[PDB]
């Protein structure tokens, strides 16, 4: 009735069986691994059944939102209105520490296109625009090879999978931006204009790409969608805590012996995951200083929090952080925490699209202030000023990049203020 000891998943329930590219990633290998099997029956079941089984799965947005993917995808169950319906798969993967999208695309692309096909059918979309980032040129070419194989096999195109539905997938390359990862900015960049995000009184379900309805979904979420249809929401709901189901991927990087990727069951203990899959923190677990749970946007937590925390949405939310993209970055006692965070703010300043004032001016201001903090040329009152500034841009920006840049500062301040104090005192008496 309850699998309290969540984690230690087995190979049978793993989705991306070809994660490390140890099997044929072409159509032949994907069909061998169990892809494109009874797809027509999924198509013939009807979009309501596809949406309904997603709610039973309790799938949450694996892109940094954690939204109830079933509820979100239900927004195009509305009848047709003359305008075409479009699906969009986010594949930017610009958040630091995030590598999962790269691996699925270049090692199991056929799952992705099938995900667009079943996803489009559920939401009634006409075509899927996979927005792969510009850097992933080899990945994009690998993705297109699978698309051509699917087109020749008759899985996609006119009468997709022999079910009457006509679905097409256009893989659109990026031109280099982290803000393109944002859903509305991605919708913007597809349209050909500058990649600034658009405000939302409206929503992509009503007004979106070319003005037609759209829904930006992460690569992982759509990729696991067909297997959810095959194995059921009940099978998917079995894993993970309540409201925390599924087997989210994990990108472990930083001061680990063997940084890697693993598709571990959700709500896994953080210590357990690092110990076996990654190999443990360099210099032993006691050498840990701080950990980035789910990417740069997610605030850091110290080792004391790291002692026992389940890797999921709710457990991290009560731990003053978020799951985000499950990008676990560890930082040992040899890591300059202030320098590392300042680099993250530097990245955010170099990636802000400059549209709204709080993100255009606040992030740059926070960059300059944090630069002084690294050198120590400041005063203790500046820490509080940095806190107020980070709150001023929080929730006042068009997209969640401003909140995505304010959280690391808030995370650093509330957990390493004595380190900041010591550095400033060190600067003070040195320059006497």
């Amino acid at each position: 009735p309850k699998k309290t000891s969540f984690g230690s998943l087995k190979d049978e329930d793993r989705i991306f069986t070809n994660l490390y590219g140890r099997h044929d990633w072409r159509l032949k290998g994907a069909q061998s691994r169990g892809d494109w099997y009874k797809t027509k029956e999924i198509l013939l079941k009807g979009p309501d059944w596809i949406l309904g089984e997603v709610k039973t799965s309790g799938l949450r947005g694996r892109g940094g939102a954690g939204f109830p993917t079933g509820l979100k995808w239900s927004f195009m169950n509305k009848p047709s209105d003359g305008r075409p319906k479009y699906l969009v798969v986010n594949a930017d993967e610009g958040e630091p520490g995030t590598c999962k999208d790269r691996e699925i695309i270049r090692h199991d692309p056929h799952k992705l296109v099938e995900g667009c096909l079943v996803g489009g059918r559920a939401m009634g979309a006409r075509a899927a625009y996979i927005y792969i980032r510009g850097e992933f040129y080899n990945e994009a070419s690998n993705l297109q090879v699978a698309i051509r194989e699917a087109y020749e096999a008759g899985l996609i195109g006119k009468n997709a999978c022999g079910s009457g539905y006509d679905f097409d997938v256009f893989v659109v390359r990026g031109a280099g931006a982290y803000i393109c990862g944002e859903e509305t900015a991605l919708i913007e960049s597809i349209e050909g204009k500058q990649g600034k995000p658009r405000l939302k009184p409206p929503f992509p379900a009503d007004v979106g790409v070319f003005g037609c309805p759209t829904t930006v979904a992460n690569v992982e979420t759509v990729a696991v969608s067909p297997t959810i249809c095959r194995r059921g929401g009940a099978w998917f709901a079995s894993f993970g805590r309540e409201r925390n189901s599924g087997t989210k991927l994990f990108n472990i990087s930083g001061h680990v012996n063997h940084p890697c990727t693993v598709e571990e069951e959700m709500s896994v203990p953080l210590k357990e995951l690092i110990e076996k899959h990654a190999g443990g923190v360099i210099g032993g677990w006691d050498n840990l200083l701080a950990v980035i749970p789910g990417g740069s946007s997610t605030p850091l937590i110290p080792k004391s929090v790291c002692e026992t925390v389940l890797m999921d949405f709710d457990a991290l939310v009560q731990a003053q952080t978020g799951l985000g993209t499950a990008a676990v970055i560890v930082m040992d006692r040899s890591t300059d925490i202030v320098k590392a965070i300042a680099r993250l703010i530097e990245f955010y300043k170099h990636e802000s699209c400059g549209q709204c004032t709080p993100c255009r001016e606040g992030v740059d201001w926070m960059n300059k202030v944090m630069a002084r903090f690294v050198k120590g040329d400041a005063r203790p009152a500046e820490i509080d000023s940095l806190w107020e500034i980070s709150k001023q841009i929080e929730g006042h920006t068009i997209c969640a990049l401003g909140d995505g840049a304010a959280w690391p500062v808030q995370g650093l301040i509330r957990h390493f203020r004595p380190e900041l104090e010591e550095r400033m005192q060190q600067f003070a008496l040195q320059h006497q």
Binding site: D11, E12, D13, R14, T17, N18, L19, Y20, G21, R22, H23, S32, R33, G34, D35, K38, G94, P96, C99, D101, R102, R106, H107, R133, G134, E135, N138, F170, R173, G174, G176, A177, Y178, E191, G192, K193, Q194, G195, F210, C212, R230, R231, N251, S253, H255, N257, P259, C260, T261, V262, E263, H277, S296, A327, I329, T335, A340, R343, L344, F347
Partner: protein, 214 residues
């Protein structure tokens, strides 16, 4: 300098000779046909990228020529070129060297890789070699963070880099030999160095764990 105001120069002038090869033209029209009719302006980013491939760097003439074929006003084309980072508004030298400097890849001593390139090339961060072979600049996160410090040579990822390993890569480019894309270590793509902690069993065939219904 990354300046966003183009001042006319003999090298980069609106009369600079640029056009599209016929093979590029059929590629362009296929790009435009991917988008719905009436919104052909959406092809600005891929088409402008096409001009980059056959020119290395795009001058103002390339950005104007993209405007004519796509009917987009030149100002909007200028917006896209300056906003996105990849578009080289200034000439670059053959192999473009991009080094990640974000925290996840810097935590594993990425500056050692940057220092190694600096020593072998002799070119300081930002400029280009006199023979126009390497253009060393730093870049933000490129996704491959679980892999060790890496580079983005031209259009290839070289992960799990090590200061001597990039020395081999540079001389291979200097001699014309292409370095193999992928990590420069035992790890193939992203697997743990010690061994496969998961997916050690043959994947189950079609129909496994499949409900009765569908």
């Amino acid at each position: 300098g990354a300046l966003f105001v183009h001042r006319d120069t003999p090298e980069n002038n609106p009369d600079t000779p640029f056009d599209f090869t016929p093979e590029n033209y059929k590629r362009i029209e296929a790009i435009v046909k991917n988008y719905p009719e009436g919104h052909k302006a959406a092809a600005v980013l891929p088409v402008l990228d096409l001009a980059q491939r056959q020119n290395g760097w795009l001058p103002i003439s390339a950005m104007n020529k993209v405007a004519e074929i796509l009917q987009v006003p030149p100002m909007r084309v200028y917006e896209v070129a300056t906003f996105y980072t990849m578009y080289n508004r200034k000439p670059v030298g053959k192999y473009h060297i991009q080094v990640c400097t974000t925290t996840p890849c810097m935590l594993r001593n990425s500056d050692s890789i940057l220092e190694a390139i600096q020593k072998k090339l002799g070119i300081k961060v930002g400029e280009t070699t006199p023979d126009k072979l390497f253009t060393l600049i730093e870049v933000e996160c490129l996704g491959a963070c679980v892999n060790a410090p890496m580079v983005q040579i031209n259009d290839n990822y070289y992960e799990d880099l090590t200061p001597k390993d990039i020395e081999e890569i540079i001389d291979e480019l200097k001699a014309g030999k292409i370095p193999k894309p992928g990590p420069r270590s035992g790890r193939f793509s992203c697997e743990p160095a010690g061994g496969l902690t998961s997916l050690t069993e043959p994947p189950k065939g079609p129909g496994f764990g499949v409900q009765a219904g569908l």
